[PDB]
Amino acid sequence: YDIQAWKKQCEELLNLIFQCEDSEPFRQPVDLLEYPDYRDIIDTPMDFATVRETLEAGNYESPMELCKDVRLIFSNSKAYTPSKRSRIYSMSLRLSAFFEEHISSVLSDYKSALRFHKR
């Protein structure tokens, strides 16, 4: 029932994601010189360094907010891909599966702890 435990759990999950070769295209903001039309397609860029920095700054109140930003990394990849068979999009799907597998208990434990706090 630790209401704060999600933060270190998210830090550790972000460390695992950074060790994953599949996270390479998503570790830093998409380079607009490499993809000049990116902002014509994507309204809200997101990447894992921005997620880690937001967390470290104390700018996430809950793991649900962090999860919304990580899911935005994957929806941006899906929206920008010219093909469902592209290399970067394919990496995003594996990384998303790994992220969802690991974030589930973090969310469950946090929501359970908050329900206990307000019991």
Ligand SMILES: O=c1cc(Br)ccn1CCO
């Ligand atoms: O998300 C995508 C998908 C393709 Br295909 C190319 C670039 N980006 C940005 C991350 O590299």
